[PDB]
Amino acid sequence: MKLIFAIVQDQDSNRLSDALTKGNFGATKLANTTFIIGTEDERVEDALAIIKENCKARQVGGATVFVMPVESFHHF
Amino acid sequence: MKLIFAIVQDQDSNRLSDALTKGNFGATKLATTGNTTFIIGTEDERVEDALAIIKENCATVFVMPVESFHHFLEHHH
Amino acid sequence: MKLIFAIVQDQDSNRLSDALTKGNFGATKLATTGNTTFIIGTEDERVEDALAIIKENCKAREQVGGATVFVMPVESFHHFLEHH
């Protein structure tokens, strides 16, 4: 399991949550906007691909992503 | 040391902070999406206690390994 | 690469972002509860520099001051950029 911290532009935010849900990822937003995204190790590449694809220029556009190891995952 | 990310509903939020304080855990609340995310630093032993509180007062939880922890503190008169 | 979570007092916040930019660190500020939380991506070597800034830029409120920091390992880092 991996925890992904994705920092993206506000402009990109809404469409990225749509794309992330569409792709079956559970995500959380905190305002640039920061997304926290839990994924299984295999699905990581898919997630990045979505993020890459949904980051556009406002003239300039970008996204920064961190992939963090998870000791354990729990859903209650 | 572990860093715990807990995503919970607002309805659960206020009670959980009360329960978390009560249990001697230092926590931080972020208003997110309508949900709240709690970041909870804990020692490896106390992790189970923390999870139990969350479970009982609600949720999705991640337990992250911490390379290094630091606290700086000052008093003056 | 390391991800740093720094919880600091609001009063310290603006000055710490100034100091963190000045030191060439990219940081992100979250409004939280009272305290502000900074997320700071850094290379393993620069970690000590970052801590020092945080330590230095935490002052006493009112009498009392403090900051709490977590340094998290990063499996992988990714950056995507475009111009038009």
Residue numbers in the entry:
A (entry chain A): 1 to 31, 41 to 67, 92 to 109
B (entry chain C): 1 to 33, 40 to 64, 96 to 114
C (entry chain B): 1 to 33, 40 to 68, 92 to 113
Task: Please quote the paper that reports this structure.
We also determined the apo structure of LmPstA at 2.9 Å resolution. There is a trimer of LmPstA in the asymmetric unit for both crystals, and LmPstA migrated as a trimer on a gel filtration column. In the apo LmPstA structure, all of the T-loops and B-loops have disordered regions. The overall structure of the c-di-AMP-bound form of the LmPstA trimer is almost identical to the apo structure with an r.m.s. distance of 0.6 Å for their Cα atoms when they are overlaid. However, there are significant differences in the conformations of the T-loop and B-loop between the apo and c-di-AMP-bound structures. In the apo LmPstA structure, the T-loop from residues 33–39 are largely disordered, indicating that this loop is flexible in the absence of c-di-AMP binding. The C-terminal His-tag of the apo LmPstA structure forms β-sheet interactions with the B-loop, possibly affecting its conformation.
Here, we report the crystal structures of PstA from L. monocytogenes (LmPstA) bound to c-di-AMP and in the apo form. On the basis of these observations, we conclude that PstA is related to the larger PII protein superfamily, but has diverged through evolution to specifically recognize the bacterial second messenger c-di-AMP and thus is structurally and functionally distinct from the canonical PII proteins. The structure of each LmPstA monomer is composed of a four-stranded antiparallel β-sheet packed against two α-helices on one face. In the LmPstA trimer, the β-sheet of the three monomers form the core, and the α-helices are on the periphery.
